[PDB]
Ligand binder design. Structure first.
Ligand SMILES: Nc1nc(=O)c2ncn(CCN(CCOCCP(=O)(O)O)CCP(=O)(O)O)c2[nH]1
Ligand SMILES: Nc1nc(=O)c2ncn(CCN(CCOCCP(=O)(O)O)CCP(=O)(O)O)c2[nH]1
Ligand SMILES: Nc1nc(=O)c2ncn(CCN(CCOCCP(=O)(O)O)CCP(=O)(O)O)c2[nH]1
Ligand SMILES: Nc1nc(=O)c2ncn(CCN(CCOCCP(=O)(O)O)CCP(=O)(O)O)c2[nH]1
Ligand SMILES: [Mg+2]
Ligand SMILES: [Mg+2]
Lengths: 172, 170, 172, 170
């Protein structure tokens, strides 16, 4: 229905944040004597992943996984990882954590493959809607309960290509 | 190079599956919850087809395809089409030996939190057991012989045989 | 809603038909100097495939493919074939052809892989609802416009395990 | 064994993509129909991320993963999430040379009958062309050098590099 997108987080603010995020992930896994892999969750994480891994100055791998989401459904794997994660630095890259329902199950599935380390990096965070206690090691921004778009996040499959995070305001 | 002779004839398979049908039927009789049989593609499609026709309990038929240093992949190429949360789930497989695949598969499905979770296998090689995995319904216990037929293949062959045969090499 | 399943095609009639179907597929590909593969379409074709290939007295392969269906959507591939079909006797095994919409696109996709021969075998057929002219080389039964169940075919994911084809009658 | 030196620096990539953004924008300006960019996973995720941010036309971002005697597989491991029928579809890929994958992919997507169907590639090796496939938008034309970076890998490595580099062997 009739809406309007207003700039919430400018392109410059995201670039600086990701710069620091990558400048937080680097010294974490700087001396780990094991291979590293970033796992992005399709579909709306491709832009976050692309910008983050370019700031991660650690020789790693980049993989993807498309999972269905809990919401109360079962978390199914539509597209699994290509490479293996057993004994590897796995860093789950998510665009937004509101409920934590989906991500909790994703982490549980990957944990079955027994990686050396398993962490989560998210760009946006809605603690306002948190339903499941799930540990997040890296958070870009903690945001209000606003329906956001841009930077991978969609609204009716739209606005994914926006270089900034915007809020949706229904014309009423 | 090879030839194939019959180990477990078609008639003997039908008799065993008929017995398996009765066992599974009484176990999940008067359970109340929904039931679903999950087959592990590919070589379990035939076993599933004959087994589910012997299970006289209103159940669903779902499928799943898994992939194969210690357990290289066990990825999910094709996940289930339906939910299993709060249902009675019976995993249908043709062969169990090392227990690698069934162990991880049971773990993955356990995360969806079904009411019950059992395993029904057509064949079983107890000698190759690397991982102790609980199996309730076993069709046949066989020695470490390489077998084919009834869904089981050798280099993509003999999947359509109505019997379980052995591969002798020349 | 409240319904009742009545026997339409008994188990004996199907077994005899499949016996003849396999006794129609065998002498077709009896002397073909190329590998053969049966392609079943998940999910409701597993029972048909299992019984048919046991009557096909020709050394072949058995593969599966899960496709989304046209209905007006795009036919997408949820699960593709494991093995290749280029230069092989491909026989698409379907449980029911009502519109032909889905199967037409499935055949087009497989045809791109350039097999030697490409045919279709179906158990049930509803010419009453045929929307797309699609050549079917093997038909088990031509049926009325009755909502059928059993033998792989479902109704709200039910009745798949039935050894017979049954019709659904709504209690009114 | 190896080392990696820069061929196409980060700055040069951004400048080229900026130019590509304007070209694609005018081509699909005042088209009316819906637009969608289809990326070929994996090594096109970064290119897609930077390219779609330069395309100033309301479009969708979909993805697809394909597999690789003549064209052994070209199976679809992960199909698109949305329909493309009656839409303007632009295939986004990193490297084109043999033209094997792009040819079949274009064929598969053509069956869904979109309004238009074009291809945008980051790199191009015209020397290895086995199949003549139409490509409208090309980022860089390079000789037959094995390159990495910007999504492109060598044994699952260097995918995260912000630049296009060459692999020299020792
Ligand atoms: N379009 C949109 N705008 C929002 O502000 C929003 N918040 C949550 N969601 C979706 C809920 N969803 C958040 C992430 O899913 C988004 C699907 P993706 O963008 O394809 O990755 C729950 C997953 P979780 O349990 O791990 O937190 C939103 N979607
Ligand atoms: N094709 C074949 N023939 C055999 O005689 C055999 N014995 C063990 N295996 C191992 C295959 N088996 C895989 C069974 O999954 C279905 C794949 P398909 O047998 O190729 O159709 C592993 C059981 P595990 O997880 O307990 O080790 C055999 N495979
Ligand atoms: N449950 C049920 N009962 C029916 O009598 C019936 N007729 C068509 N359909 C579904 C329509 N559908 C028929 C086959 O799809 C059934 C899904 P499957 O059982 O998982 O294979 C159109 C495909 P087509 O374009 O190739 O003919 C039915 N479903
Ligand atoms: N990794 C890599 N590095 C190269 O320098 C290269 N040159 C050609 N190719 C061929 C790979 N290329 C596949 C590109 O798809 C993305 C897979 P990814 O490059 O491993 O991320 C085939 C293009 P074609 O269908 O025209 O033959 C290369 N691959
Ligand atoms: Mg996400
Ligand atoms: Mg069907």
């Amino acid at each position: 229905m009739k809406h309007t997108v207003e700039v919430m987080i400018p392109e410059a603010e995201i670039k600086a944040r990701i710069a620091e995020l990558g400048r937080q992930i680097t010294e974490r896994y700087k001396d780990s004597g094991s291979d590293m892999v970033l796992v992005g969750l399709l579909r709306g994480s491709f832009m976050f992943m692309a910008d983050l891994c370019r700031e991660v100055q650690v020789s790693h791998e980049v993989d993807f996984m498309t999972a269905s989401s809990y919401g109360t459904r079962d978390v199914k794997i539509l597209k699994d990882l290509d490479e293996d994660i057993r004994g590897k630095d796995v860093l789950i890259v998510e665009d937004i954590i509101d409920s934590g329902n989906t991500l909790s199950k994703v982490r549980e599935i990957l944990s079955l493959r027994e990686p050396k380390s398993l962490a989560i990096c998210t760009l946006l965070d809605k603690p306002s809607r948190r339903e499941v206690n799930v540990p997040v090691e890296f958070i870009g921004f903690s945001i209000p309960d606003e329906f956001v778009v841009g930077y991978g996040i969609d609204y009716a499959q739209r606005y994914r290509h926006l270089p900034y995070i915007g809020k949706v305001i229904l014309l009423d």
